Scaffold this active site. Structure first.
Site, short mmCIF file in Angstrom:
data_model
loop_
_atom_site.label_atom_id
_atom_site.label_comp_id
_atom_site.label_asym_id
_atom_site.label_seq_id
_atom_site.Cartn_x
_atom_site.Cartn_y
_atom_site.Cartn_z
N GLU A 145 18.62 -1.02 81.99
CA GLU A 145 19.31 -0.10 81.09
C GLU A 145 20.78 -0.52 80.86
O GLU A 145 21.71 0.23 81.16
CB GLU A 145 19.18 1.33 81.63
CG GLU A 145 17.74 1.78 81.64
CD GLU A 145 17.55 3.15 82.25
OE1 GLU A 145 18.53 3.91 82.40
OE2 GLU A 145 16.40 3.47 82.55
N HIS A 163 24.43 -1.20 79.54
CA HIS A 163 25.38 -0.52 78.64
C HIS A 163 26.48 -1.47 78.19
O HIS A 163 26.29 -2.24 77.22
CB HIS A 163 26.00 0.72 79.32
CG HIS A 163 25.11 1.91 79.33
ND1 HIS A 163 24.51 2.38 80.48
CD2 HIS A 163 24.71 2.73 78.33
CE1 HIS A 163 23.77 3.44 80.18
NE2 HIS A 163 23.87 3.67 78.88
N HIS A 187 23.32 -1.17 72.49
CA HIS A 187 24.38 -0.27 72.91
C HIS A 187 25.78 -0.85 72.68
O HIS A 187 26.58 -0.29 71.93
CB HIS A 187 24.22 0.11 74.38
CG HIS A 187 25.23 1.09 74.84
ND1 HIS A 187 25.07 2.45 74.71
CD2 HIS A 187 26.46 0.91 75.40
CE1 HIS A 187 26.14 3.07 75.17
NE2 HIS A 187 26.99 2.16 75.60
#
Length: 298
Positions: A272, A274, A232
């Site tokens: 997750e 970012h 990302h």
């Protein structure tokens, strides 16, 4: 001594359990600053672990990327509200509505002379916000390009990812635009950053590669060891090193001096990751789904 022995992780829990930490950056005063897109906050985290929350004046602003300017102001995009935000070094907000509706401002970076540059993900254009608050816009030649992250290159031009145009854009202060198609089809570039080597480094979220593009446009790639890692964001570390988040694998990646990739497995369930940033003391900071994470090397 293998790399897995030589790291350790810390987490910083937040005020509410589901605030949407997304973007993160570092200040020269040692503070880490982050956006919380669900809570509608800009927050700082200092060297003693103290958190200060600032309420974004526009409701449901969907705050995404942010940077700390050379003047110490915090600039951020209000992706949901079609505005650029500024939190002054002093602690007051100013907001700058964009000239065209539903632009989806997204990426943000500082240019020269205090200029603030940004992508308009749904606008398919690049903006420049100058000292006096004037906004200038520049159209991309293809609609549905989805310009995402943006950064100031070593050549003083602005370099950005075109997620769905599968290209790297370069725009100068004169508005002169060039686009560089990626060699991997549907690679879907997202994060971009300027390396200490003077090249631009980016992630291919679907290509599953780290890309490097020189300021003259020469592209090289690195295969990410973990399949379907969905990288990302990306940042320069110390010397030639490069750090990135693997949103899909709950891992942090690192390109070491010997030009190989190390991956670090996070413990947080649904981490997750970012946004990612590199602190002055060599700490690697990242925005997890529900909290802030930190990686240190020994």
């Amino acid at each position: 001594s293998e790399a897995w022995m030589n790291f350790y992780l810390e987490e910083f829990n937040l005020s509410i359990p589901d605030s949407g930490p997304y973007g993160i950056t570092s200040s020269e005063d040692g503070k880490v600053w982050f956006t919380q897109h669900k809570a509608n906050k800009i927050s700082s985290l200092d060297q003693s672990g103290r958190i200060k929350e600032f309420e974004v004046p526009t409701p449901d602003a969907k705050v995404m990327c942010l940077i700390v300017s050379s003047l110490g102001d915090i600039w951020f995009t209000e992706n949901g509200a079609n505005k650029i935000g500024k939190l002054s070094k002093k602690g007051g907000f100013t907001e700058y509505p964009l000239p065209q509706p539903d632009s989806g401002p997204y990426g943000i970076t500082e240019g020269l002379n205090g200029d603030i540059w940004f992508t308009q993900l749904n606008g398919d254009r690049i903006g420049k916000l100058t000292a006096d608050g004037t906004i200038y816009e520049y159209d991309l030649p293809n609609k549905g390009s989805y310009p995402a992250f943006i950064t100031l290159g070593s050549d003083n031009a602005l370099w950005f990812t075109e997620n769905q145009n599968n290209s790297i854009g370069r725009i100068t202060n004169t508005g002169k635009l060039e686009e560089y198609p990626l060699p991997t089809n549907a690679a879907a570039p997202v994060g971009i950053t300027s390396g200490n080597d003077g090249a631009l480094w980016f992630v291919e979220i679907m290509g599953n590669k780290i890309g490097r593009i020189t300021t003259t446009g020469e592209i090289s790639e690195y295969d990410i060891p973990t399949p379907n890692a969905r990288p990302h964001a990306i940042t320069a570390g110390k010397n030639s090193e490069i750090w990135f988040t693997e949103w899909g694998a709950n891992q942090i990646g690192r390109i070491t001096n010997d030009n190989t990739i190390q991956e670090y497995q996070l413990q947080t369930e649904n981490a997750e990751p970012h946004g990612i940033t590199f602190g002055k003391d060599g700490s690697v900071w990242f925005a997890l789904k529900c909290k802030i994470g930190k990686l240190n090397l020994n």
